[PDB]
Design a protein around this ligand. Structure first.
Ligand SMILES: Cc1cc2nc3c(=O)[nH]c(=O)nc-3n(C[C@H](O)[C@H](O)[C@H](O)COP(=O)(O)O)c2cc1C
Ligand SMILES: Nc1ncnc2c1ncn2[C@@H]1O[C@H](COP(=O)(O)OP(=O)(O)O)[C@@H](O)[C@H]1O
Ligand code: SF4
Ligand code: SF4
Ligand code: SF4
Ligand code: SF4
Ligand code: FES
Ligand code: FES
Ligand SMILES: [Mg+2]
Ligand SMILES: [Zn+2]
Lengths: 225, 126, 41, 99, 91, 217, 258, 231, 63, 59, 441
């Protein structure tokens, strides 16, 4: 009776965008391209400073900053041609990532595996025997089979689903027994239980389908005489 | 870590590689992978199995249900699903298209025009 | 969606004899002769 | 996205005359990143990828193309944002993608 | 009883009727109309009757409800999924 | 996750639908994979902000099913989490409460007296036993009897509930309940008669008139 | 007077004459509806257009609510989702399971809105309402169990045409839209009743049981049976033609055909 | 008050005549005068009440059509009004249309017992009309005199309160005879409780003339002065 | 023209093309297609994950 | 669950269970099902032509 | 200390018929006194006097009557008249106060209608009376005829020269007609289906003209407070409340009746003094649903200290509604009582909006199954959620009225429902759950 929240309100469909200007461009070139600074005004230091101030005020980032948007990582350190220390910082970050990404792997990389190799050697007819794990797999499978057999033998029989042609009556039990019998007679059904009292007993009754029993031990029927 | 797509990442199995890149090594790898698929299947089936059972205090022996389905078998596929997603399992097993208007509408739409998929690009590998 | 892990290594199951789930016959000296052939270039 | 990820900004640091347009989404794997590359620089960029130190161990998994000329948002048209990659499909004759 | 008469059309929902029910053998490639016409009208005490086309859910057609409280007493109503016709047991 | 707040909307306990399906499934898989108390505690503490009562009960079931030994790591890390979650439970957490209590009893954790006290207060003092299914209630009583923990009030409550729902008793549950009560030595002649013949008549089972007069809920 | 409002935090400008639904449609955000029709009067019966406003505790019916300065509308909020789900659940309660047999299977806005906005499963497990069918002539087939009592049919008959025959007779869940007496709806514009009816309660009898929407190819053409000329859409499944419909042409057709 | 449409009856066909008497026409004129000249559509309910009074406590379809024609309004509107309002019997009823309240107050006071007694005395079930056209039982909602429950209403006109398993039978016999008590069958007054009054016990004040005089001119002057001072 | 036919057909009706792509890994092909669809949808098949079918049958198909 | 040869069933009364909803036609990946339906004289929603191209159908 | 109102401070004198209810007795007891001067005072003075007195609506809303009247337009340039509708329709369960003034002091109601109409600048006042009150409608019509004959109403009302016409509309049985918009539509002649409320019917209501809907009790008490001063009425109630109110007790009480009493009187004192208390004593009390059926119930735990005030009842969670108190004893079944209430609401639903027109029937079916006992524990929370979905999603506030009693029962007597479900399931084992719909009852 709890249908609210059936649909997943929280989903795993999320995207992030990172856009940067060319690292080759200088502050003056960036200002000229964006239009804040006129092409011929680059010489005038005062004009360049005014254009930089306007750019910072309007676009919410310094002209030196190369990051238009960094939703991916929100990095506050731009990489530019002018600041040569940015290249060194990025190189250090790249090598840090190269170490850490491999470190966090569980199976892909392992220096312990590199320096202590573990080999599988084919040396016997049974390839399972060469591996302790596969021998245990065989033993576990046989143990499971034996446990299932023991449980079933102790129970002594097996319930089974038995087809019942009366499951396909024209009318439901919710209808009157007289109506059910009349419809069955009209459709000429003679292999179904149309007893009025039985139908009345089953009226508005919910119960499981017909079941039979398979009785152990399983043996072949024979005509010995 | 970043590319697992099923229960594999939480199963303890082994993958095999050869120091010779020849047909013989490839054949050995295929044989070993066939053998290890058995171990993976065994682990997967065990993940949905009820091995333990109620033990009587007086006799310290198992109390097996005589007229319960769980006595026939030790593997119950719906075990974890029922245990964790109880509401979803109940809705799935109680509401269908023959008695629920919403289920009928979903069935009709599903089989007339497939489910709507939001626009986007994906690359998924196995 | 993902989860956070603190111990990447899955430590080996306890090898003590007293501890439960101990298999005395897991290793066979006659069969587990890998070490002899392991050091072979 | 609970993994250690870094953008492939080396390409755009080296090719200093190109602008960067990169994406990552949960629709993809945690370690998967999309980028826009101009055709006139595609060959040189692949030359750099094939022999750069950290990009040396790189394999071209896949390559194909999309006929973006007839691409239209059939549902949720208003939800499109200027940062989405779909904005580059409209009015462009073709879009060839490598992975 | 002309099938094309106004009275016949109004009674049969402006469709040309086939009293013999034999034309369907060719039109729809079946005698199901003849077979279903044999079943008599099922009389139900309640004003509203529930039909599932069988004994259990998913063994027939989707569960539907038919109003037997017709503006004219005793008028049979036919189920849309199956041709079974139900009428109220006026007393 | 980015821009995600895991504080429960109910302000009592987190729910599975609040978390992303991927996170829920992956944490459940990790819990299932855990094969020792140490690693299970590590996983639970690392992902505590995403942990749910369903997953905690499932972790207890996994420990019981695989007979993972209970040790110092359990009693020192897992037990506080169980105490906190059980205290924060309410009526709608009947499934988790019954499962956790039953599996702790079956595992026979004879320590964590505070944990057992919290479980008892939730079960009887707060009258949360009325939301436990009859079969689940019988299994919980049997498990607590196996652990040897319990209260006379709780056992009397279970006996009265069994007598009330004698008609719904299944033979397997009857056997389990009879074993539990015989082992504990607690019981009544009316209870034993009901267990022997659940479908007996009112005059067949002497004392049912007094039980009905008591009118146990 | 131009007025600034916010839709999901997106600034927008609309004159005060606009309603919430009209402002949303102009700005490109879709709102479900069952009873609101552009050319018909305004009614707030179905209440499927409920949205969330920051300063309004109760849900606001977008169709019959005028915009206010500074209004903060949250159409993507969880509260709006819950409102849509509740209304859809109430609508689907008592709704017959006639999708396979209903002629509007592929053109049912109720199905579409239930898939996109409402919940995916129903809780109502009880006897549904049952309504007797009505005879409106050889042009309109009526299956009144599928009626949602949105009165679009009544409004069209009283407003677009001069015929005054349809009405909501009764009170409560037993209310029945239609003619109290048994008579045929013989207006020259009876065809458009099927188009306005959104839940397949009224359908095209000649076209009944013929085909499905997803297997038709549509062509825009002009009518010739009347010297007025009408912008029509012709749907064909191969050589066979079927289901001629109107298409919007306000200068000549004004959305209706004879 | 069963179906939301026209029931196919031979005695309620369109051919059934109906004509207002001259007194009814005068009453209709008075009703129209009371209502606005243009808004003649508001006189549907009084017209339906007049039709019920003129007929055997029911509104024929022909009468409804006549009302629509007189009011210059669609017949569908009259149909909607008649179907929406349940006090209009669209089909013939019995000589006594008993209407037993069944809301929670009456239910607590024992409405079910009174209903069973009425059914036993009238030899008919709830809702169904008796074989002979004499009794018609119906269950209705709060009739207003909750404090005097249980209660019934006859012909939508006369209310009988404070009924019991024997008072109701006595009331039914009195109705059949022709002469019966109007109001509660107990000894209580209109709303006075069975035990007695708890208020208004002072007979002197109630009987004597009650006068309350206020210096309205002075009050108005004071209000204006206060308003000016605030200004 | 399997890709062309998949584009012509809706999502569900294109799945059996993935069975046809590989005659011995059809389960894995279906798994990849369904994984892509659910990645677009932003959800995961918790039912399959908890029932373990998508791993055991993938390994059976590998065998 | 084996899928062998297609067949059309009937209700126990003998009436056809097929109502021309064309859901099967739309879902058929191979476009192997062709359905045309006309109202039956009694008024039932029953198909007049229901063809399955066994050579074009993937089982 | 609140209660024990003096017999000489009761506005509704002759509540129990002891004198003539017609013009003779009305003038004997002081009706139609200085009406000319009251009119001459001016509409602004009347509005200010009401505001100072603090009279608030006697219906469910409880809004400030003075402010409600002041909201009406001063003048209509288009020439549209203003209408004063008196909603005498009393169809809410347990409410009897309204009918006890129509047949006792109709002239007081007519005088109040005239005063309010003059204050509001309204040419016509229509008294809409439910068709059940046939005798009361006849009495009020006779009173109106007497007023016209004596010249109080009509041309030169009370010699003031202000033309004012009082008409009577005897509607039929529809509890929905009590709603303002539904009342207006019923007067218009359409179906009593409420209307969405962005137009604020005070601006465009009846016939498209400004109309104001007011309760009979408020209209009747207006002239008396006008004559006796605003301070008099304001001093007979707790602060922020109006004053003397006409309560009516219906449920299991020794002496059911309708009595006028001071505002804020304790519920226990009101039950014990005027009506003799519960049948088996206060200890035998099970619950009380004061202020009509619409508002939730109150258990004996809170009934002890609750005061009959709008604010106090709102804080406790069971509004004062129409001052209709139904006392449910330990003999009755709260589930059955609320089931009957839900059936009443289902019957009375106009049917315009799907939330109400479907949830009412759904709740009725769920309550019926709960009463039978063939229901699950989760169905209680499902019913709670269904009521929360109905509320605030409707147009006329009838969905909320139908939802509130069910929520009150769920929160108060959850254990009773759970015990009944357990009792049913103990005697009715059922392993298999049917996928079919629940059988019709
Ligand atoms: C469903 C419903 C029924 C109502 N029934 C009545 C009623 O019977 N009598 C009444 O006076 N007010 C009733 N009201 C309230 C009126 O609409 C309105 O608020 C009141 O009559 C105005 O007078 P007041 O301002 O003094 O409360 C009902 C409201 C609703 C939503
Ligand atoms: N037939 C069953 N089918 C599916 N899951 C079962 C079944 N029986 C037990 N489980 C699981 O066993 C756990 C309960 O353990 P236990 O009390 O021993 O079983 P039971 O009471 O049915 O004999 C639950 O996780 C429950 O889901
Ligand atoms: S309108 Fe037709 S297709 Fe839509 S839900 Fe109703 S019956 Fe199904
Ligand atoms: S028949 Fe169709 S258009 Fe008319 S009220 Fe019902 S749903 Fe609306
Ligand atoms: S058309 Fe196809 S899906 Fe529809 S009923 Fe017939 S066989 Fe079934
Ligand atoms: S809430 Fe109910 S009574 Fe009010 S308008 Fe909607 S359907 Fe009519
Ligand atoms: S579209 Fe808003 S109420 Fe129907
Ligand atoms: S309960 Fe009978 S009149 Fe109100
Ligand atoms: Mg168990
Ligand atoms: Zn059927």
């Amino acid at each position: 009776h709890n249908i609210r929240y059936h649909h997943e309100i929280h989903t795993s469909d999320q995207t992030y965008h990172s856009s940067y200007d060319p690292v080759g461009e200088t502050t003056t070139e960036r200002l000229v391209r964006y239009g804040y600074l006129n092409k011929d005004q680059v010489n005038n230091a005062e004009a360049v400073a005014a254009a930089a101030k306007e750019f910072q005020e309007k676009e919410k980032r310094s002209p030196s900053n190369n990051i238009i948007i960094d939703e991916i990582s929100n990095s506050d350190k731009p990489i530019t041609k002018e600041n040569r220390e940015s290249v060194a910082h990025h190189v250090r970050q790249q090598f840090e990532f190269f170490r850490e990404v491999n470190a966090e792997e569980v199976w892909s990389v392992s220096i312990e595996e590199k320096y202590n190799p573990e080999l599988y050697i084919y040396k016997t007819y049974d390839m399972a025997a060469d591996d302790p794990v596969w021998r245990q797999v065989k033993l576990d499978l046989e143990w499971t089979f034996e446990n299932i057999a023991e449980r079933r033998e102790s129970l002594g029989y097996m319930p089974t689903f038995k087809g019942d042609p009366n499951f396909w009556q024209a009318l439901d039990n919710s209808f009157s027994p007289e109506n059910i019998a009349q419809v069955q007679s009209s459709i000429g059904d003679k292999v179904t239980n149309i007893d009025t009292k039985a139908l009345a007993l089953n009226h508005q009754t919910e119960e499981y389908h017909k079941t039979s029993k398979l009785v152990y031990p399983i043996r072949t029927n024979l005509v010995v005489e | 870590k970043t590319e697992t797509y099923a229960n594999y990442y939480y199963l303890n199995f082994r993958s095999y590689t050869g120091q010779h890149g020849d047909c013989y090594d490839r054949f050995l790898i295929r044989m070993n992978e066939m053998c290890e698929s058995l171990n993976i299947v065994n682990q997967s089936i065990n993940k949905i199995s009820k091995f333990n059972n109620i033990v009587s205090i007086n006799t310290k022996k198992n109390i097996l249900n005589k007229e319960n389905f769980n006595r026939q078998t030790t593997v119950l596929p719906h075990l974890v699903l029922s245990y964790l997603n109880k509401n979803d399992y109940n809705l799935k097993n109680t509401k269908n298209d023959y008695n629920s208007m919403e289920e009928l509408i979903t069935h009709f739409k599903y089989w007339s025009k497939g489910l709507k998929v939001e626009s986007g690009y994906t690359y998924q590998s196995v | 969606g993902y989860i956070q892990r603190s111990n990447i290594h899955e430590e080996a199951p306890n090898t003590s004899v007293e501890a439960k789930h101990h298999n005395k016959t897991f290793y066979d000296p006659i069969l587990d002769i890998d070490e002899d052939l392991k050091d072979d270039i | 996205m609970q993994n250690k990820y870094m953008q492939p900004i080396q390409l755009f640091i080296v090719f200093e005359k190109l602008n960067s347009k990169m994406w990552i989404s949960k629709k993809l794997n945690s370690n998967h990143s999309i980028a826009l590359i101009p055709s006139n620089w595609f060959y040189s960029i692949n030359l750099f990828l094939k022999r750069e130190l950290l990009f040396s161990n790189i394999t071209l998994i896949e390559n194909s193309a999309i006929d973006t000329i007839s691409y239209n948002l059939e549902t949720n048209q208003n939800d499109l944002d200027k940062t989405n990659i779909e904005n580059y499909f409209f009015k462009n004759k073709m879009l060839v993608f490598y992975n | 009883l002309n099938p094309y008469s106004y009275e016949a059309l109004k009674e049969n929902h402006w469709l040309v009727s086939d009293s013999s029910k034999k034309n369907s053998e060719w039109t729809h490639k079946s005698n199901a109309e003849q077979l279903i016409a044999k079943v008599p009208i099922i009389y139900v005490d309640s004003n509203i009757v529930r039909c599932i086309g069988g004994t259990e859910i998913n063994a027939g057609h989707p569960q539907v409800y038919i109003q037997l409280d017709t503006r004219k007493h005793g008028t049979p109503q036919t189920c849309k999924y199956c041709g079974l016709r139900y009428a109220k047991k006026m007393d | 996750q980015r821009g995600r707040d895991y504080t429960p909307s109910n302000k009592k306990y987190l729910q599975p639908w609040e978390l992303e399906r991927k996170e829920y499934v992956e944490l459940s898989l990790a819990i299932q994979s855990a094969y020792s108390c140490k690693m299970l505690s590590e996983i639970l503490k690392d992902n505590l902000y995403m942990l749910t009562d369903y997953q905690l009960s499932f972790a207890m079931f996994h420990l019981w099913n695989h007979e993972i030994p209970i040790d110092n790591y359990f009693y020192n890390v897992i037990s506080p989490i169980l105490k906190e979650y059980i205290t924060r439970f309410d009526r709608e957490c009947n499934k988790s409460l019954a499962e956790i209590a039953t599996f702790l009893g079956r595992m026979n954790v004879q320590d964590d007296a505070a944990l057992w006290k919290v479980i008892e207060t939730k079960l009887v003092q707060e009258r949360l036993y009325r939301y436990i299914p009859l079969n689940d209630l019988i299994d919980l009583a049997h498990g607590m009897a196996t652990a040897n923990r319990g209260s006379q009030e709780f056992y009397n409550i279970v006996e009265n509930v069994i007598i009330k729902h004698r008609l719904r008793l299944i033979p397997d549950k009857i056997a389990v309940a009879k074993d539990c009560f015989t082992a504990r030595k607690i019981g009544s002649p009316l209870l034993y008669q009901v267990l022997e013949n659940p479908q007996a008549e009112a005059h067949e089972l002497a004392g049912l008139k007094e039980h009905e007069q008591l009118k146990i809920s | 007077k131009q007025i600034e409002i916010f839709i999901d935090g997106k600034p927008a400008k609309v004159d005060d004459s606009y309603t919430i639904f009209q402002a949303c449609y102009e700005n490109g955000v879709i709102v479900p509806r069952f009873c609101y029709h552009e050319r018909l009067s305004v009614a707030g019966n179905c209440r499927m257009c409920l949205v969330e406003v920051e300063n309004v505790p109760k849900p606001v019916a977008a169709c019959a609510s005028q915009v206010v300065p500074g209004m903060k509308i949250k159409t993507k909020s969880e509260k709006t989702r819950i409102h849509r789900g509740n209304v859809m659940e109430f609508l689907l309660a008592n709704h017959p399971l006639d999708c396979p047999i209903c002629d509007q299977g592929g053109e049912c806005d109720l199905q579409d809105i239930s898939s996109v906005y409402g919940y995916g499963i129903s809780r109502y497990n009880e006897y549904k309402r049952a309504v007797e069918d009505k005879n409106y002539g050889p042009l309109v087939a009526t299956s009144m169990n599928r009626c949602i009592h949105c009165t679009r049919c009544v409004r069209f008959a009283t407003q677009i045409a001069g015929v005054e025959d349809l009405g909501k007779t009764g009170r409560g869940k037993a209310a029945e839209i239609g003619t109290y007496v048994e008579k045929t709806f013989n207006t020259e514009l009876s065809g458009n009743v099927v188009d306005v009816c959104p839940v397949g309660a009224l359908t095209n009898a000649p076209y009944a049981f013929t085909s499905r929407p997803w297997e038709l190819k549509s062509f825009y053409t002009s009518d010739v049976f009347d010297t007025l000329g009408s912008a029509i859409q012709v749907d064909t499944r191969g050589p066979e033609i079927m289901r001629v419909l109107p298409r919007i042409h306000e200068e000549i057709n004004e959305e209706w055909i004879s | 008050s069963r179906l939301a449409a026209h029931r196919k009856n031979d005695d309620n066909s369109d051919s059934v005549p109906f004509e207002f008497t001259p007194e009814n026409y005068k009453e209709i004129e008075k009703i129209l005068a009371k209502y606005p000249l243009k808004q003649k559509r508001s006189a549907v309910m009084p017209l339906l009440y007049l039709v019920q009074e003129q007929n055997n406590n029911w509104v024929p379809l022909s009468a409804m059509k006549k009302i629509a024609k007189l009011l210059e309004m669609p017949e569908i509107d009259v149909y909607e009004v008649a179907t929406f309002y349940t006090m209009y019997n669209r089909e013939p009823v019995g000589k006594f249309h008993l209407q037993i309240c069944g809301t929670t107050p009456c239910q607590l006071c024992g409405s079910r017992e009174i209903t069973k007694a009425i059914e036993e005395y009238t030899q008919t079930k709830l809702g169904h009309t008796s074989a002979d056209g004499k009794w018609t039982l119906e269950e209705v909602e709060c009739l207003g005199a909750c404090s005097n429950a249980p209660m019934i209403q006859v012909n939508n006109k006369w209310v009988y309160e404070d009924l019991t398993t024997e008072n109701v039978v006595k009331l039914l016999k009195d109705l059949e005879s022709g002469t019966d008590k109007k109001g509660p069958q107990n000894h209580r007054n209109q709303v006075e409780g069975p035990l007695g009054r708890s208020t208004l016990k002072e007979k002197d004040f109630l009987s004597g003339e009650i006068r309350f005089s206020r210096d309205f001119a002075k009050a108005k002057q004071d209000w204006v002065a206060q308003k000016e001072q605030e200004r | 023209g399997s890709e062309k036919l998949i584009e012509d057909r809706p999502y569900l009706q294109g799945m059996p093309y993935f069975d046809r792509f590989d005659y011995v890994s059809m389960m894995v092909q279906e798994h990849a297609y369904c994984l892509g669809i659910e990645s677009l949808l932003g959800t995961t098949n918790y039912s399959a994950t908890f029932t373990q079918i998508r791993t055991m049958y993938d390994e059976l198909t590998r065998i | 669950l084996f899928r062998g040869e297609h067949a059309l069933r009937r209700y126990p009364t003998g009436e056809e269970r097929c109502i021309a909803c064309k859901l099967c036609q739309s879902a058929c990946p191979a476009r192997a099902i062709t359905i045309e339906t006309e109202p039956r004289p009694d008024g039932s929603r029953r198909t007049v032509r229901y063809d399955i191209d066994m050579t074009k159908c993937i089982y | 200390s609140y209660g024990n109102l003096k017999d000489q401070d009761r506005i509704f004198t002759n509540l129990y018929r002891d004198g003539d209810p017609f013009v003779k007795g009305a003038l004997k007891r002081g009706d139609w006194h200085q009406t000319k001067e009251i009119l001459s005072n001016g509409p602004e003075w009347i509005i200010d006097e009401i505001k100072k007195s603090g009279l608030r609506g006697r219906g469910g809303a409880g809004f400030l009557s003075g402010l409600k009247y002041s909201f009406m337009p001063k003048v209509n340039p288009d020439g549209r008249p203003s209408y004063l509708v008196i909603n005498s329709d009393e169809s809410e369960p347990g409410t009897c106060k309204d009918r006890e003034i129509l047949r006792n002091d109709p002239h007081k109601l007519v005088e109040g209608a005239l005063v309010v109409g003059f204050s509001m600048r309204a040419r016509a006042a229509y008294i809409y009376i439910r068709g059940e009150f046939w005798v009361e409608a006849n009495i009020l019509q006779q009173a109106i005829d007497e007023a016209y004959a004596k010249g109080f109403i009509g041309k030169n009302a009370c010699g003031s020269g202000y033309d004012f016409d009082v008409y009577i509309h005897r509607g039929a049985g529809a509890y929905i007609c009590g709603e303002e918009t539904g009342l207006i539509e019923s007067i218009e002649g359409k179906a009593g289906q409420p209307r969405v409320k962005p137009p604020f019917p005070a601006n465009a209501g009846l016939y498209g003209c400004p109309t104001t809907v007011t309760n009979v009790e408020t209209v009747a008490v207006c002239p008396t407070i006008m004559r006796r001063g605003a301070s008099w009425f304001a001093s007979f109630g707790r602060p922020n409340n109006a004053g003397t109110k006409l309560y009516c007790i219906s449920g299991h009480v020794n002496n059911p009746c309708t009595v006028e009493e001071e505002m804020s009187i304790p519920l226990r004192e009101l039950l014990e003094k005027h009506c003799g208390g519960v049948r088996g004593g206060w200890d035998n009390l099970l619950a009380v649903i004061p202020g009509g059926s619409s508002v939730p119930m109150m258990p004996k735990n809170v009934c002890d200290d609750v005061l009959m005030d709008f604010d106090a009842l709102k804080a406790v969670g069971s509004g004062l509604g129409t001052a209709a108190v139904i006392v449910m004893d330990k003999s009755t079944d709260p589930i059955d009582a609320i089931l009957r209430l839900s059936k009443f609401y289902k019957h009375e639903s106009c049917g315009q909006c799907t939330p109400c027109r479907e949830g009412t029937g759904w709740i009725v079916d769920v309550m019926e199954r709960l009463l039978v006992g063939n229901a699950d524990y989760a169905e209680i929370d499902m019913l709670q959620q269904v009521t929360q979905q109905i509320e605030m999603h409707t147009i006329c506030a009838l969905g909320d009225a139908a939802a509130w009693p069910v929520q009150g029962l769920i929160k108060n007597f959850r254990e009773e429902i759970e015990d009944r479900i357990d009792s049913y399931h103990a005697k009715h084992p059922q392993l298999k759950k049917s996928r079919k719909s629940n059988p019709q009852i």
